[PDB]
């Protein structure tokens, strides 16, 4: 039940993959709040290139809106919409 080399290479090559990104990375300005969930499933550029000199970088970007629970202590809590950046296309470019 070994995973075939070409399937391994195709699954690992620089492409957008579901990444769990912390919300504090995307909205650091929102300090007073605690979020639920604290992180979000976003399509983010991941994987390797044919050579070590190259890095997997985003080319096409877009936004997705998501219901997220805002909690400010001594205030209460509500669910608002929040827009998050996602990577649609990826490229292997030299390290600058």
């Amino acid at each position: 039940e070994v995973v075939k080399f070409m399937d391994v290479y195709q699954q690992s090559y620089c492409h957008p993959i579901e990444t769990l990104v912390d919300i504090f990375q995307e909205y650091p300005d929102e300090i007073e709040y605690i979020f639920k969930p604290s992180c979000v499933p976003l399509m983010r550029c991941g994987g390797c290139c044919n050579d070590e000199g190259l890095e997997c970088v985003p080319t096409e970007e877009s936004n997705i809106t998501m219901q997220i629970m805002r909690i400010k202590p001594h205030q209460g809590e509500h669910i608002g919409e929040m827009s998050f950046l996602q990577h649609n296309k990826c490229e292997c470019r030299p390290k600058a």
Partner: peptide
């Protein structure tokens, strides 16, 4: 056609 900046064909993994 087997540029390092592009993804895949077996007849690259020939060399």
């Amino acid at each position: 056609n087997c540029d390092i900046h592009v993804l895949w064909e077996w007849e690259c993994f020939x060399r």
